Each structure stands twice: as structure tokens, then as C-alpha cells.
Amino acid sequence: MRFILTGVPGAGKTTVCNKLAEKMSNLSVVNYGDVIFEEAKKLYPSIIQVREDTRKLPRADYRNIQIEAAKKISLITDNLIVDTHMSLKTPYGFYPGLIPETINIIQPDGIILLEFNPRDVIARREKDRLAGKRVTRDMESETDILLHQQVNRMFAVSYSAINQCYVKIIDLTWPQEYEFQHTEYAVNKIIEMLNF
Amino acid sequence: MRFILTGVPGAGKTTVCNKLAEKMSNLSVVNYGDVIFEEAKKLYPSIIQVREDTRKLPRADYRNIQIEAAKKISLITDNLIVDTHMSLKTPYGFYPGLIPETINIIQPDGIILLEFNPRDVIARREKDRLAGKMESETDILLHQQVNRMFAVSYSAINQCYVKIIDLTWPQEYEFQHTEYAVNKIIEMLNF
Amino acid sequence: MRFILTGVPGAGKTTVCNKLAEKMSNLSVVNYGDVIFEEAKKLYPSIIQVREDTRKLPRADYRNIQIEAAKKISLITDNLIVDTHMSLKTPYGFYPGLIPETINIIQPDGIILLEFNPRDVIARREKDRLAGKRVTRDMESETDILLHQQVNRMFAVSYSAINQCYVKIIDLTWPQEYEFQHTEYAVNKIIEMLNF
Numbered sequence: 001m002r003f004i005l006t007g008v009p010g011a012g013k014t015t016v017c018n019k020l021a022e023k024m025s026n027l028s029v030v031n032y033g034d035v036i037f038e039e040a041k042k043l044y045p046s047i048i049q050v051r052e053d054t055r056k057l058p059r060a061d062y063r064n065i066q067i068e069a070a071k072k073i074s075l076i077t078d079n080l081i082v083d084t085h086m087s088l089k090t091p092y093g094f095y096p097g098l099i100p101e102t103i104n105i106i107q108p109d110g111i112i113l114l115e116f117n118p119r120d121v122i123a124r125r126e127k128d129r130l131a132g133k134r135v136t137r138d139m140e141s142e143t144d145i146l147l148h149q150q151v152n153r154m155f156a157v158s159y160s161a162i163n164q165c166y167v168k169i170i171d172l173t174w175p176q177e178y179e180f181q182h183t184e185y186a187v188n189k190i191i192e193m194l195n196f
Numbered sequence: 197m198r199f200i201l202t203g204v205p206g207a208g209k210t211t212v213c214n215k216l217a218e219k220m221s222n223l224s225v226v227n228y229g230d231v232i233f234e235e236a237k238k239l240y241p242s243i244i245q246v247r248e249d250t251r252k253l254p255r256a257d258y259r260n261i262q263i264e265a266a267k268k269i270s271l272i273t274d275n276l277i278v279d280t281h282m283s284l285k286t287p288y289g290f291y292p293g294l295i296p297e298t299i300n301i302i303q304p305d306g307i308i309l310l311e312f313n314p315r316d317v318i319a320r321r322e323k324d325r326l327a328g329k330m331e332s333e334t335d336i337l338l339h340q341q342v343n344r345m346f347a348v349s350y351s352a353i354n355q356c357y358v359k360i361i362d363l364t365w366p367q368e369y370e371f372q373h374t375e376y377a378v379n380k381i382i383e384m385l386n387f
Numbered sequence: 388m389r390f391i392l393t394g395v396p397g398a399g400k401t402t403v404c405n406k407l408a409e410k411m412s413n414l415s416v417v418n419y420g421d422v423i424f425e426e427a428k429k430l431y432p433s434i435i436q437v438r439e440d441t442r443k444l445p446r447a448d449y450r451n452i453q454i455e456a457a458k459k460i461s462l463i464t465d466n467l468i469v470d471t472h473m474s475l476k477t478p479y480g481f482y483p484g485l486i487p488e489t490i491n492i493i494q495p496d497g498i499i500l501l502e503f504n505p506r507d508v509i510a511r512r513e514k515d516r517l518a519g520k521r522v523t524r525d526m527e528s529e530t531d532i533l534l535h536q537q538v539n540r541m542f543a544v545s546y547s548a549i550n551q552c553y554v555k556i557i558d559l560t561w562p563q564e565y566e567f568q569h570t571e572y573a574v575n576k577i578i579e580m581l582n583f
């Protein structure tokens with residue numbers, strides 16, 4: 001099947017993607033941002049080198065790369081998880097991470113949201129910064145993260161009302177018995193979905 | 197007027213629909229699911245015999261039935277209540293009961309969401325089940341919030357009303373919720 | 388830039404609009420519904436003399452006035468704020484204040500939501516009937532106002548899923564240490580947005 005996998009950043013979503021790829025042969029796990037960066041370098045190289053470079057040029061060009069990234073992902077034939085974000089926080093507010101052409105071209109069966117406890121999100125984001133990852137990203141509060149996760153629900157139901165797809169919310173907000181168990185439980189629920 | 201009437205399953209929406217059919221003529225109450233299931237046994241006799249088998253159908257085939265099922269309803273005159281569900285829970289997640297075209301074909305004035313206390317829902321579902329007819333109060337809270345988000349999306353898209361009928365208070369006598377819901381809806385139809 | 392500015396009624400949104408236009412230079416502030424009153428008088432002057440009189444216009448020609456109002460607003464060329472409502476409570480339930488035409492015609496960059504604590508909203512709506520503004524008393528509860536605000540978020544995020552715009556939630560729910568502090572805060576957050 002096809003599913004779009006989403007959650008707030010820095011909370012373990014990549015750990016879920018990396019571990020799915022390892023436990024399922026009949027599965028491609030692609031990162032929509034990676035492909036968008038890849039197809040950007042292609043179209044205009046002197047203007048594109050690093051990952052952040054994507055944002056600089058006008059939306060007319062950025063949209064047209066999102067179209068082509070989507071089309072390539074659409075060539076994938078086996079099971080597909082597309083790793084993406086329902087929305088990003090900006091000084092102007094939240095902004096959709098998808099565009100409507102992304103869902104028409106990928107024709108996913110549904111959207112998966114990983115919902116984390118905000119205290120975990122804060123802890124994990126702060127130990128990665130201490131290691132050296134996501135420097136000068138604002139320390140968000142518990143209610144910031146809560147607000148982001150609700151908004152994410154709304155975006156996804158909107159896309160469901162428009163495109164007739166499933167909306168699957170995985171609860172990872174309980175206390176872990178051991179480390180990386182949240183990702184373990186996410187990874188088992190998602191394979192159960194692909195195998196049902 | 198025409199309203200889409202909705203709520204989580206097993207909670208009393210069917211009792212509300214029946215007491216409308218009892219207490220207000222000049223009004224057609226139509227169960228959208230029954231219409232759809234019937235129309236599925238006409239076109240694909242073989243594949244469908246469980247209402248659950250409606251999505252074994254390829255998307256284009258399942259779309260087309262819900263279009264047709266909508267057209268028949270669409271041909272009705274005077275007041276009309278279309279009983280259905282904003283979403284249903286499946287192993288892949290929440291899925292919408294309406295499709296984009298359903299709303300335009302039927303041109304409803306608004307959507308009605310019957311909202312219950314999840315504790316009354318657990319109790320009611322288990323009562324029924326005991327007489328022949330699996331979710332926590334958190335699962336049910338989530339479901340009612342999703343239906344609320346589906347409703348508001350359908351309203352932004354087709355410019356219709358979104359009526360939330362609050363049935364979450366404790367009853368002073370049995371079937372009070374149902375009275376209250378029917379009176380609120382009849383008052384909406386007459387105004 | 389262009390933002391649509393919204394909030395439950397009677398809570399402080401018009402105060403915010405007035406303070407913005409008196410403070411930040413060369414910023415246009417427009418109240419969609421005032422523009423709609425004018426457009427209905429120039430068009431139907433025998434039948435609407437009070438703005439409240441538009442109800443008995445056919446819903447089909449009222450819609451046309453919203454478009455004509457939207458078309459006028461769309462010719463403003465500097466920074467722009469459109470004061471309006473995401474939804475209003477009627478006896479048929481909530482109804483959207485915008486129409487799709489309004490947003491495609493105005494091409495707003497963003498939607499701004501002023502979120503208030505419902506006790507403040509009740510208190511403000513009360514002080515304003517004592518100042519002879521409204522003739523009749525508002526009986527919405529605390530939970531009515533939370534509900535109205537929750538529905539307004541969902542409308543905002545839908546318009547953003549559909550039109551690809553920002554959704555900015557300005558939290559005015561904390562308690563005021565002094566008078567008019569919320570309004571001050573929302574004004575300064577919005578100006579910081581426009582000068583970013």
C-alpha cells in the first residue's frame with residue numbers, strides 16, 4: 001500500500017523510518033525532503049547545493065520541483081512509506097508541508113501521524129542539540145508541541161475529506177519501559193497495517 | 197431544509213432518526229449506508245454480501261455507487277435528514293463516510309453532529325451487544341474530534357452549517373438525550 | 388503582505404485593528420463586513436438600510452456582494468489586514484464567514500487567529516453592553532466560546548490545506564497583569580510579523 005508518515009520534528013520519526021526499512025523487504029521508505037533536495041540539485045545546480053537551499057527561490061519554482069519529486073515517488077511499485085511533515089512552524093504561522101498535487105500524484109491510501117508526549121519531544125530535541133544537531137532551533141514549550149500536533153491532525157483530516165484517504169493516529173505518548181520502545185511499537189503497528 | 201445527521205456509532209443516532217420519522221412528517225429520514233449497501237448488491241451481486249465488503253471494491257467502483265446512492269436521495273423534496281457517519285474507524289485508521297461529490301449532489305444546508313459522553317457510549321454499546329446487536333473513552337473522544345474536523349472541512353469546502361448538539365450531560369430520566377436531540381432538530385427545521 | 392485577521396466577536400479584535408493602523412505606517416486595515424455593507428447599499432439601497440438587513444437578500448446575490456467586496460479589497464497594494472470572522476454562530480449552527488472566492492481573489496499570505504480566555508470574552512462582551520454598544524445580552528457560556536474557538540482553528544487549517552497559506556495562532560489567553568495588555572501584545576506580535 002501507500003502511506004504518508006508524519007509527526008512533529010526531532011521526536012523519533014526518522015528512527016521509525018530507518019527501522020521500518022530494516023524489518024520489511026517489500027517496502028520502500030522514501031523521505032520526501034530528500035527527493036525534493038535531489039530533484040532540486042538536478043534542475044538548477046549553481047542555485048542549489050545544500051539542503052536549506054531549497055527555500056530561497058520563489059514558490060513557483062519550488063512548487064514545480066515538489067510536483068516532480070512526487071511523480072518519481074509515484075514510479076515506486078511495492079509498499080511505500082513517504083516520510084514527510086503535515087506542517088512547519090514559521091514566524092508567519094504554520095505552513096502546510098504538502099501541496100495538493102503531492103497527494104494526487106502519490107494517491108496514498110492514508111496518512112499516519114506519530115503523536116508523541118511533548119516532554120519526550122523536549123528531552124530528545126535537547127539531547128540532540130547537545131550532541132550537535134538542529135542548532136539555533138527555538139526551544140519549544142509543552143503547549144507549542146501540543147498545538148503543533150493538533151494542527152497536524154486538522155491538516156490530515158482536511159486532506160482526507162478532499163482525497164478520500166485513511167487517517168491513522170498512533171499513540172506514542174505513554175511512558176517507555178525501555179529506550180526506543182516508542183519507535184518499536186510504532187514500527188510494529190505500521191507493519192501490522194501493511195500485512196493485514 | 198436538508199441536513200446530514202451524524203455521530204459515533206452505537207450511541208443513539210438511530211433512536212433519534214426513528215423519533216424524527218415518528219414526530220415530523222413532511223420529512224424523509226434516509227439511512228445513507230442502507231442505500232449504498234443495497235445499490236452495491238444490485239451492481240456487484242457476487243463480490244458484496246457483507247456491508248464490510250464495500251471497500252473490497254476498487255476505488256472507482258466504490259465512488260460510483262456512492263454517487264448513484266446520492267442521486268436517488270438528491271431527487272427527494274420537502275425537509276430531508278440523511279443519517280450517516282462522518283467517519284468510521286478501521287485497522288488503517290479513520291475513513292470518511294461521504295465523498296466530495298456526495299455533498300454537492302445532495303446540496304445539504306448543514307451537518308448535524310450528535311455528541312455524547314463517551315461513558316454513556318461504552319455503556320450503550322455494551323447494553324445493545326448483550327441483546328444481540330472494544331473502544332475506551334479516549335478512543336471515543338478522538339473519534340468525536342475527528343468527526344468535528346471532517347464536518348468543518350466539509351463546511352469550508354461547500355459553505356454549509358455545522359451544528360454540534362451537546363448530549364454529554366447526565367440524564368435526569370432515561371431517553372432524555374434523545375428527546376433533547378429531536379427537539380433541537382425539529383426546532384431547526386421549523387425556524 | 389496580506390493577512391486575514393479573525394477572532395470571536397466582542398473580545399478585542401477591533402481594538403487591535405485600530406491600534407495597528409495608528410502605529411505602523413502605510414498599513415491598510417479593512418473590515419470585510421463594513422465593505423460588504425457599503426456594497427449592499429450601492430447595489431440594493433431600497434431594501435438594506437441597516438447592515439443587519441442583508442439576511443433577506445437571496446443567498447445567491449449576497450454571495451455576489453462578498454465577491455465584489457473581495458474584488459475591491461484586492462486592489463490595495465501596501466501591507467494589508469482584513470478584519471473578519473472565520474465563523475459565526477447561527478441557530479442552524481456555525482457558518483463560515485469567508486467564501487472561496489474571497490481567498491483566491493484576495494490571495495492572503497496568512498490567517499491570524501486571536502485566541503482569548505473565555506472569561507475575558509464574557510467580561511468584555513458585558514462591559515460593552517453597559518457602554519450602550521449592543522442592545523441585547525450575550526448568553527454564550529465559557530464552553531460555548533472554547534467550542535467557537537476550536538471550530539475557528541479547523542476552518543483556518545482547512546483554508547490553509549486548500550489555499551496553501553500560513554495559519555498564525557496568537558495566544559491571548561494568559562491573565563492580564565495590567566489593562567489592555569492583550570491588545571498591546573497582539574499588536575506588537577502582528578507588527579513584528581509584517582517587518583520580518
Ligand SMILES: Nc1nc2c(ncn2[C@@H]2O[C@H](COP(=O)(O)OP(=O)(O)OP(=O)(O)O)[C@@H](O)[C@H]2O)c(=O)[nH]1
Pocket residue numbers: 008009010011012013014015016124125128176178179180181182183
Ligand atoms: N535516549 C533516547 N533517545 C531517543 C528515544 N527515542 C528517540 N530518541 C532520539 O530522539 C532523536 C529523534 O530524532 P529524529 O528521529 O532524527 O527526527 P527527524 O524527524 O528525522 O528530524 P528532521 O530531519 O528535522 O525532520 C534521536 O536523536 C533519537 O536517538 C529514546 O527512547 N531514548
Ligand SMILES: Nc1nc2c(ncn2[C@@H]2O[C@H](COP(=O)(O)OP(=O)(O)OP(=O)(O)O)[C@@H](O)[C@H]2O)c(=O)[nH]1
Pocket residue numbers: 203204205206207208209210211229247284285286
Ligand atoms: N468501522 C466501524 N464501523 C462501525 C462500527 N460500529 C458501527 N459501524 C457502522 O455502523 C453501521 C450500522 O449502524 P450503527 O452505526 O451500528 O447504528 P447508529 O446509526 O449509530 O445508532 P444506534 O444503534 O442507536 O447507536 C454499519 O454499516 C457499520 O459500518 C465500528 O466500530 N467500526
Ligand SMILES: Nc1nc2c(ncn2[C@@H]2O[C@H](COP(=O)(O)OP(=O)(O)OP(=O)(O)O)[C@@H](O)[C@H]2O)c(=O)[nH]1
Pocket residue numbers: 395396397398399400401402403511512514515520563565566567568569570
Ligand atoms: N477594560 C478593558 N477592556 C478591554 C480590554 N481589552 C479589550 N477590551 C474591550 O473589549 C471590548 C471589545 O473590543 P473589540 O472587539 O475590539 O470591539 P467591537 O467592535 O465591540 O467587537 P468586534 O469587532 O466584533 O471584536 C471593547 O469594549 C474593548 O475596549 C482591557 O484590557 N480592559
